[model samples]
Target: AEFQSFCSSASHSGQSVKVTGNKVGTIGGVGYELWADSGNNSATFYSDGSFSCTFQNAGDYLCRSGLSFDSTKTPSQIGRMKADFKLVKQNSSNVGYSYVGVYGWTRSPLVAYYIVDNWLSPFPPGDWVGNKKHGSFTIDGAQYTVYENTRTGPSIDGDTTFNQYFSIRQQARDCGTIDISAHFDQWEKLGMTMGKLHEAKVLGEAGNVNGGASGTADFPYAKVYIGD
Candidate 1:
């Protein structure tokens, strides 16, 4: 329960730091930093760099304020990744779930595209259930509910093979936008074949059942809107 990372200045490892406004950077050479894992979390990076996370307690936690790109960037060179996110649940043991996404590495498979705004769980005793829905769409204007998950081995800087395509966002937005190269051309027509572009997040994932809860996720601003 003690894995930490903080940056707003003084960073060196791989190198891909561009979190202006507030200032802080990391994301190069893999093992992407900018972390917070566990309850009683605290993160703040804003001047324009955009970042925020304030949770009280709920063990199984997750906090990431994006940027990681070195070994991948296809999909016509990527073009659209915006944010003005928000998530707030002061109590009620805020179960778990909060997202903003784009994760990579795709030689065999390792992909992600989340937009889950807010999700509180307790489903049949929690654990977030199995997740097996594959219907619903709408890109630029929002509206999503597509799910698919698969993981074989290696990940967490190991890299073996994994698959993900979650775009859950029925309704819950505080200012969002995502083109992600047109959602990778709609997951490459559902075949899911695309690689490189390893890291593009504005995330807040926390889940720590009945024992603990608190919430606050924010991204006052975010950008990566370059295209042809």
Candidate 2:
């Protein structure tokens, strides 16, 4: 109902694309996709640079059908990227692990990263052995703890191990603005270097290895831009 209302707005023009499974394409003239290996997941991409997902039952699922950026250029080339989104709904239940915020990757150094604005899980994920603390920093008037985890599994380069960088916001917000490039600058200051940009997306994710979750999330408004 909310999605339909938002979709009908005159501000959002063009067609809507709905899909299931690991597919990649463009929505609203921007790169968009839906990625999931297990669970019941469906997404709809709107022409007004917005997307929505419904995970009736999900485990090990990742929803990337949202505001996106081209993977061809580096972050600096984009020159201080910024994002704003209204997380219309986070109606989740039985979720063990869920993350909501910026998710992306870079080549050359091969890093997968997360700038978590909000998450559903204990321990802010964890403090396992392989997860090392790299200090903390303030961005956009909030503090975030920097962490690095070595993950050896499916990745952009196929099955392999690579550093997974995280900047989990100490304070969480469901909807707001993200200083996307600001975190990158902070990471570099901590000796965590990033390569050419692969993807930078406003992501919605749910579930994990231990449990499953069911819910619906809608992003009626979202935008990613360069230079303020």
TM-score of each: 0.30, 0.86
Candidate 2 lDDT, tens digit per residue, 1-228? Answer: 323233344243458888887778887566676876577788887766677887756675666643344456677875787766666555677777777788888887788888888765443554451378976678766898888888987787898888888888887766677888889988888888878887777788777665667787777666666777
How far out, in Å, is residue 126 in model 1?
A: 14
- Computed on alpha carbons, the lDDT of every model, listed in order, comes to 0.50, 0.73
lDDT winner among the candidates? 2
Candidate 1 regions off by >4 Å?
Answer: 1-45, 58-130, 133-146, 149-179, 186-188, 191-201, 213-222, 226-228
TM-score of 1: 0.30
Q: How high is the lDDT of residue 1 in model 2?
A: 38
Task: State how far residue 213 of model 2 sits from its true place (Å).
Answer: 2.4
Regions more than 4 Å wrong, model 2 = 1-14, 65-72, 120-130
lDDT of 1 by residue, 59-154 (tens): 544455555666456655665554333434333355654444433444334565555545544331212321556667886567766666775544
